[PDB]
Symmetry: C3
Amino acid sequence: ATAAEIAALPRQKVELVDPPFVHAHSQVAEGGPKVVEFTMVIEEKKIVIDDAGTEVHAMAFNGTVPGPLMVVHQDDYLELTLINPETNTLMHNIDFHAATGALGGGGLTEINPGEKTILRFKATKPGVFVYHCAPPGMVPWHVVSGMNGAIMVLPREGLHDGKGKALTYDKIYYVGEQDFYVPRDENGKYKKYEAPGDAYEDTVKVMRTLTPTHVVFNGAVGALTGDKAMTAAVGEKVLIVHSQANRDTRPHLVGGHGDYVWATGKFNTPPDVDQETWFIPGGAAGAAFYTFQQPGIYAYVNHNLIEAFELGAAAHFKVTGEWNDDLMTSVLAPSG
Amino acid sequence: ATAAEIAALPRQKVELVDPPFVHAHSQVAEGGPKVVEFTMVIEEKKIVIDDAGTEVHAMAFNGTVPGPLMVVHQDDYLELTLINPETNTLMHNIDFHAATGALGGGGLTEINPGEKTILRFKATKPGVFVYHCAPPGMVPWHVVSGMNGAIMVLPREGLHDGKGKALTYDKIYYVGEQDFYVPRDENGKYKKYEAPGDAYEDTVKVMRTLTPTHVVFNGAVGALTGDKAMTAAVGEKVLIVHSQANRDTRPHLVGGHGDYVWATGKFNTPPDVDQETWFIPGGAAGAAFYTFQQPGIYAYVNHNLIEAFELGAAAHFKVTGEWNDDLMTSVLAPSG
Amino acid sequence: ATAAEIAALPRQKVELVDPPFVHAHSQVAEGGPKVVEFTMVIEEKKIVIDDAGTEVHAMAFNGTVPGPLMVVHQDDYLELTLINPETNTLMHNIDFHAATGALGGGGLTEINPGEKTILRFKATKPGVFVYHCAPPGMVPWHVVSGMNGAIMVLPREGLHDGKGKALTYDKIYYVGEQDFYVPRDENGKYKKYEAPGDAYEDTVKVMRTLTPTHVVFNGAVGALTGDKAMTAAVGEKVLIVHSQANRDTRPHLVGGHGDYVWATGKFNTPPDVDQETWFIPGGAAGAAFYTFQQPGIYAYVNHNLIEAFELGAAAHFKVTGEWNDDLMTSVLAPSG
Ligand SMILES: O=N[O-]
Ligand SMILES: O=N[O-]
Ligand SMILES: O=N[O-]
Ligand SMILES: [Cu+2]
Ligand SMILES: [Cu+2]
Ligand SMILES: [Cu+2]
Ligand SMILES: [Cu+2]
Ligand SMILES: [Cu+2]
Ligand SMILES: [Cu+2]
């Protein structure tokens, strides 16, 4: 397309929403290609990641960890206005794994505190993709400080299974998984720092052990539980997008399955089916489609159970509806 | 189907056998859907896992680590009677990843010592699936104490390749891989405990390093080597079911291949072919089909070779038959 | 084929080149099956792997880490003459994951210093495969000392996508990724030794932590950068073969994609497409095909960013050509 043709395309400004929710969109594209506009302000901010009060100096796109899910359709253009407020202290940028050129956009979006930039790229490939900050020489530190999220590039005709049958979800959730490396003192207690820079040296030492102290969903142990548990109903079709920008994960819906899973996150790659536990490598996003069949509470976890239950990688789903005794029944309840 | 229809299905009791062997079954279903009954007694007992007398207080379904492989066909019902003797000290339950609802059955099978329960579930999806104990609040501790196994839900018409041709094995083995986390004193010696609970704190500390002290097959270093090597003959077709309920593994048959590998373990997902090393994520089972072409001793390992040869994840296959010089030949033996 | 039939086949002597380059070959087979001859001399030598002068006692096939890529076609025979110079101190052998029998050839190629051997095997399965040394009792030590490489067994008809359309590359690069476990002294300084055997005990203790001190490409931090950055031009199709003989990796071309990726490395397994980050388990090789569309510098990394940017797993591609503003453009460059 020529600059003239792109300039003639319609523009649509989208208001982002905080994970695990996803901004309104249509699965099947409405009309032809458009330039979809998003705006995100970067906030370096202290966040608490567990019940003990452990703090992390997060580097957050749009103020959240993970950053929000941006949704467009194949061949649409995503135009991001990225702002680094003067209140921040570090330079930041953004690398869209969905984009082509200049290190995912990283080479064209380096902004110091007090600056902004607008990047536009054509979303030529359909799938879910990670996006993350990557300042030369300080790449992993920004990413494991929570500066990452994902986008979804839907095929213009929506999702289909491996044989061409349409797959239409009733609702979608975006689960961003984050590995944190928090320094500890001599008593094994997590340390707190005044400014982000103060924690750098101590944090890199922990990062080098390749052993996170916390592995969480939506920025904190238990973030997606209780009144923040995800919800569904028997018969409801749910797409769960999951990302991990730095480390491998293996999602599992306890009590359910992944009916169709684009484990690589790419929609032109046929989805695996009837999955118990799928695998998403560090640096990628994946998506699982499931139709709930039983009511009750479900856990959704990274299936290295130590990471799930000791480190924080566990969420819950509350599901309404009628119990199905054909699928499962307690013939004899626990008894002597 | 109707309530009367389910109640009218035949019921069949099957006797289990210890891993790596598998109980009698037919690859193609015999007759229509049935309710297949199994019974397993849980045994908490000390087992020695290496050549230095290292002990683990195992939590073993049917007295073995891994628990036995249960085999049924798609749309049969699996009805398990699970028994927790009064001589045990902990509450246990079971989550079948093959099942749908109540956390895989975990929510309906919590049995204290002195209790039993009977769970029935319809095996709606074909494939090999992990099953494991999962008491709320102590899930990884039970799983890494060896309380896990797998089941195989065969398609009613048996296995097929990606093109629809039948794949009929001559024999099948079940290799359960276990990551253990045994505490050590300050001198580096593995600690011993009187009761399972006594080791809880020390064990969770090791678990949090995400670094197992041992990674073994069939519950101990060298359990499937030497006089306990698995066997085959040139020309024989073998299915090797492999599971890991908590941590990733990458099986490899040294000197062989995985001709067809359902790496995700699900039969409706076409198998990868001609594999050198496949990948099974923690929380899943996989299956590899191979026709032996050469006689001799083969090693079968988790291909992180440190895990295989330093930590214990190495098994052997002893294969009889005629050597094929076309496939391989020493043109010039080692010589000065 | 009979011994006589094999004896009658034409032979072709190949001259190997140092990674990441690949020796001359034809994608589509030129004529019928042949016996392709290769010769490699094993060199035990010191290599410096980081800018702090850290040393590793490398055990290098052909004198490099990784060993060179050998290319043949399906059903050709690969005849390797392996030499262990009297100047070396250890016995070595070779296991080709591409081969069938005798532990991949390892059981037939054990040569002490001063000996040589000639092994011939039929390349019956198409794809990229790892090859590595594996002396009984000291397998991982040789592999993590850099004694591994890969070979590519091309289909006779060249590469094809999942629907049969031909995929012909303009350039091919071989990236061998190595996990190193270098002992440190009481002050965190890396130790040096005057003999390979002298570091054995210290090295095994680090290996057991399953935590590498370095993760590098072509044997050293920054190896494939600067004077060694890989090159291409906009419009060129490039195949990147990547192997890791002992530990998992997750390749990612920063600013690009894996248009077609045989993640399992096997050509009869259809490639995944539009990949952002692919996964190669320890003990395997994989291959990604990409057509460059933007000029500039690209980073190529293992996407656990700590492994890439703290431990050393990062390479660069320098691409020439015209920038494409349709694919990506800076609407507003970084500014106040
Ligand atoms: O089935 N998840 O523990
Ligand atoms: O080919 N197994 O080391
Ligand atoms: O997109 N690689 O950090
Ligand atoms: Cu940043
Ligand atoms: Cu990235
Ligand atoms: Cu238990
Ligand atoms: Cu589970
Ligand atoms: Cu060697
Ligand atoms: Cu190997």
